[PDB]
Write a protein that binds this ligand. Structure first.
Ligand SMILES: Nc1ncnc2c1ncn2[C@@H]1O[C@H](COP(=O)(O)OP(=O)(O)OP(=O)(O)O)[C@@H](O)[C@H]1O
Ligand SMILES: Nc1ncnc2c1ncn2[C@@H]1O[C@H](COP(=O)(O)OP(=O)(O)OP(=O)(O)O)[C@@H](O)[C@H]1O
Lengths: 260, 294, 547, 260
């Protein structure tokens, strides 16, 4: 076991008290927003992620996926609940240990690619290594190798504004990989990729996990890839989990036309 | 009026100048000797050599465009022709010290003012005070504390030129996109690295705008400094005003404006073959050192 | 000066102000009457009502916080206590005019700079000039065109406070994302609609920082406006500097600071119950308006020195209680001389001739009329505290660290001091540091406190000899001054237009002892007008003699 | 016929002359970038789009799709070639006619969603109607109806930063639709959508074209949707077209492993 999540909850806006009460009754998200304006990002999310596992997360746009990934990295704090990473509540971590965790344990990939315009690809790709005080030489080469795996080594000297959506997405992905952490949080890193390069990246991930038994959380909307690589799948709706199976979801499901 | 604020202020300034006399005199002597030595080094450097070196530096910094280096050469030649070289050197040392101190105390202050919403609400009134209070009223206490000379002018110029850098640094560091900040945090980047790698390089626009404002305000606060003994081109303006000769006052003001434009262009060229340019600039600095020795 | 830029500029300025007087005369009259009406309206409304209204508006604009409103009430009531209400009203007048014009001419200009990479470079040097060039140099021609009053203060404040608005507006219009601009273009958004819907709202941060900068600069540029007749707290600052009294100077400055913070808050509340709130605000403004709705002459110009203050106040009273309506205006020296020369002012009584104002008399003189001395007994020379052993210039050896203290460059006193340092030998190696009069007075006061030796280039009459105990130094060679006289001055053409006051000014005369008595009366605390009343009651026959 | 494109070409960076010569020989994109740094966005793209047709465009990330869409709307000008829209070279249009065209003829949807943070959803969704001087009432309601079709009517009062990727994408899509133009340029408007909502939007588009015979250009990386709705398909590589068929591509193709 690598990660635990217990009664995790994060509610945005204000009037959080009445909204939390409403969900405690079990009212839907839209009515709660109508009364209070507080959009329940995620409610009573409780589960476990083991090591060397591609925990794919899936759900409707507006179901609380990116929020969960952010909470795991504690970029935002929940209103109620506990996130344990190696038997260590991230909310009870002093800045130094949190920093070591964010550098080595887990690295994140965003929907918007979180890219620095003022830095080339080779300087964004090795940002996660500069902060670790890695020398110029090894980090330079690790970034180059990651880009070559992502088919961007010819653009290493260019800037993001000189690039498209797919190449920027691959840049974010490589920046996450170059750091070679023990956990890879990934929020739709394949949304803007062609099938061929998408499958290249899937094979990349499978190789990584096979050799380096490495935890990966992979948000996705494509059923095909989740089944191909997802050793375990979690489906979300309106901020709550509905099933956390691997391949039985296609056989047994509570009104999941999501699959068909 | 009924509330004797004037008496309280007079008593406070009397007490402070009678108590802090040692420090004020010490800093007066040290700053005066140091700045006069700076001016001596600058003036001993012949004016033609200084003009040539600065024009070459503008050439190196501008690439192929010549309007700026040509204007620099022309303006400094005009100044040296009108006999305002030593005055210009004094004005340079004063302005450079004032702007340097203002930047050094503003950029960190603006940064720590961005990281705290309490410091912002504590410093906004202070900046408003330091920038709205007339420089004439900084003539009295600075003179009473430091005494006539150069240091009071630097003190007043700093007081009047800090606010722009402070405000623009705060604004630029408060404007960088949250997504980039989240990205940097997610890779474990301390405030130091997140500041030297992300916020400052993207806020450079506003920061250097505030620096330009700082420099222009320091230069505008030169007559008020020549009114408390600070030598330079403010003395020329004051003499013109008393003699009512618009020509000499205008000449001094144009020298000021030329200096402002040159400094502003050099600073702006910091916002955004290089080995050879570095080598040539090093050679020029060595020549300046010879001239100081010569 | 091989190249004669000085002569070129002086000739050009003479020619231009000789050719372009009419239209500028009409506009200066129009703007002066407009601004005077605004200030009169703002002063008619009682101070309590305006304080209540401003704190009410602060409450409405702040919401549930109570910092800004309490600060407003506290500061404004404080000012009303210190007696700086009318000055505050005049300062509000000129500051709002300067800021409004500056913003109006900057934001469009900043946008133009942002939409044309040419205009940016064509205007940036102009902004540098306007923001860095000393305001004094074009102060004198500004007085030539716009004449004394609020108008040139407005002009100078504008051309000193416009650059920041412009620059930060340009940045804000340039620092917005290009992707959003592409999106707005794809939807057929004219530059106007894209400017009002996308550009301005996103640039408001930088633009409003620029506006705050503009307001602070225009508030700093009050003294440079108050030395050319503009009323307000700048006059207080100048009179405090002359008196070397940091109390009054700090009070006026802190009043300016309070006004700056008030305006800045009320403006920053424009970056980002409602109907009740708005109706209450309109009712407050209506109440302000309701509350507001509740012969021979002569215009004189004088300087912010105690001597001339006493003289002019005495003259003004003698005129008023003998059928006049006087308009006295406190200016700088050279500004006053120019105003008298150009005929805008009907005369001045402050010509310390022929050794103190010799440069001014020489440059002018062909465009004024010297009516003769009005007080004899004035002296100029070196001055040393009465407690020092030295009693003549010939005995100065190593005092004041071989450093004289000046008054201001170009003043005839400093020229005479330079001549003295070359005529003698004991102090050939002494120095002469040019400063302002305020700095000299403050240094003298501190040295007296610390009992330390000091030598200054002073004159009598003056408050130094009353507030401190000093002594003149002997000048056997007479290179410094010989009991110069204060002389009356009028504009060329008063004998024909207003002779009923020419008689007074040519017949005007009264002794230095009286001036020192009046200054002594003032310094104890009495207002100058009461001092004039007292001395005229004691010296009525002389007053009747002048008429 | 609605649109013509003849020898359309757009080359970025500088040294465009030698790069254009290189492509005239037929050298690949990466070598050209290596020598010159000029990335050939698109080369000698020549084709025709008829009215009432979903011309789907597809290709590898880094093949020149968004550039083509931008060129059609003349947000950027080509180095060589002609774009005709209703027998009217957009490059020879004075500002007023271009403005009428951009308002009524064609509306664009971007990969990055091109959203205004300072405006709510209801104010971004009706931006294309504010500029047309449409009254508040009709535009308000058209925007609301579009949002309801996009399942965002509960978020009409929120701001984009209070929203996720999918909802922002649907906002951009609705803003394009609310304007009800004759041409819909769409650059991966379904990349960040769940299958269910994706299929809702596909049915939306098919309805629009069926009733209102309306031209749609739809960039995509998903095989499934292009086949479901694409009446005609164009595939791109390294900046050049390779086939512009509708459904024969699956039968005949020059080394298009791109498709199953
Ligand atoms: N900064 C914010 N302030 C308020 N609410 C927010 C904020 N960021 C996200 N939310 C809320 O979080 C909820 C889910 O966010 P999430 O980003 O998890 O949506 P998504 O599931 O990520 O959509 P997609 O999966 O297509 O990205 C949304 O309903 C949104 O209202
Ligand atoms: N502003 C720019 N400056 C220089 N080159 C650019 C610029 N914008 C785009 N490009 C070039 O355009 C080429 C294609 O751009 P495009 O946006 O067409 O890629 P894409 O095909 O859109 O990728 P995806 O389809 O995954 O978005 C890229 O190779 C990129 O280098």
């Amino acid at each position: 076991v690598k990660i635990k999540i217990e009664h995790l909850t994060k509610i945005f806006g204000k009037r959080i008290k009445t909204a939390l009460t409403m969900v405690e009754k079990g009212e839907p998200k839209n009515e709660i927003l109508k009364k209070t304006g507080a959009t329940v990002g995620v409610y009573d999310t409780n589960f476990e992620i083991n090591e060397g596992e591609i925990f794919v997360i899936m759900g409707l746009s507006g179901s609380g996926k990116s929020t969960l990934l952010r909470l795991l990295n504690r970029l935002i704090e929940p209103t109620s609940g506990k996130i344990f990473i190696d038997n260590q509540d991230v909310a009870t971590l002093n800045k130094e240990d949190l920093l070591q965790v964010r550098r080595k344990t887990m690295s994140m990939v965003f929907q918007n690619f979180g890219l620095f315009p003022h830095r080339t690809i080779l300087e964004n790709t090795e940002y996660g290594l500069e902060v670790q005080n890695v020398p110029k030489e090894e980090r330079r080469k690790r970034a180059e190798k990651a880009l070559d795996n992502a088919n961007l080594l010819d653009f290493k000297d260019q800037y993001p504004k000189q690039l498209s959506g797919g190449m920027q997405q691959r840049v974010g992905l490589a920046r996450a990989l170059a750091n070679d952490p023990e956990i890879l949080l990934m929020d739709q890193a394949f949304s803007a990729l062609d099938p061929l390069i998408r499958r290249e990246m899937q094979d990349e991930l499978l190789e990584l996990q096979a050799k380096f038994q490495k935890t990966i959380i992979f948000v996705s909307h494509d059923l095909n890839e989740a089944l191909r690589i997802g050793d375990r799948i979690a489906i979300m709706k309106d901020g709550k989990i509905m099933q956390i199976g691997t391949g039985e979801e296609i056989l047994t499901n509570p009104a999941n036309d999501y699959v068909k | 009026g009924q509330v004797p604020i004037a008496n309280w202020v007079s008593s406070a300034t009397d007490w402070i100048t009678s108590t802090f006399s040692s420090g004020f005199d010490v800093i007066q002597k040290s700053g005066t000797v140091l700045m006069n030595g700076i001016t001596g080094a600058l003036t001993a450097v012949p004016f033609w050599l200084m003009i040539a070196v600065v024009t070459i530096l503008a050439i190196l910094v501008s690439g192929k465009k010549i309007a700026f280096p040509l204007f620099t050469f022309i303006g400094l030649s005009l100044i040296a022709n009108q006999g305002l070289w030593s005055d210009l050197m004094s004005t340079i040392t004063l302005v450079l010290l004032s702007s340097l101190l203002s930047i050094i105390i503003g950029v960190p202050l603006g940064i720590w003012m961005a990281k705290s919403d309490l410091v912002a609400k504590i410093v906004q009134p202070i900046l408003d005070f330091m920038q709205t209070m007339p420089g004439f009223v900084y003539l009295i206490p600075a003179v009473a504390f430091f005494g006539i000379g150069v240091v009071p002018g630097v003190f007043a110029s700093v007081i009047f030129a800090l606010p722009p850098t402070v405000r623009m640094t705060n604004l630029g560091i408060r404007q960088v996109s949250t997504e980039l900040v989240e990205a940097a945090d997610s890779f474990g980047s301390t405030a130091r690295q997140k500041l030297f790698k992300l916020e400052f390089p993207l806020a450079k626009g506003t920061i250097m705008a505030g620096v330009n404002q700082t420099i222009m305000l320091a230069l505008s606060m030169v007559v008020i400094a020549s009114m408390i003994g600070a030598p330079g081109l403010g003395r020329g303006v004051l003499a013109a005003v008393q003699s009512a000769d618009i020509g000499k006052g205008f000449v001094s003001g144009i020298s000021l404006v030329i200096l402002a434009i040159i400094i502003d262009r050099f600073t702006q060229k910091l916002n955004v073959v290089k080995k050879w340019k570095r080598g040539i600039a090093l050679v020029s600095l060595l020549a300046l050192i010879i001239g100081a020795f010569s």
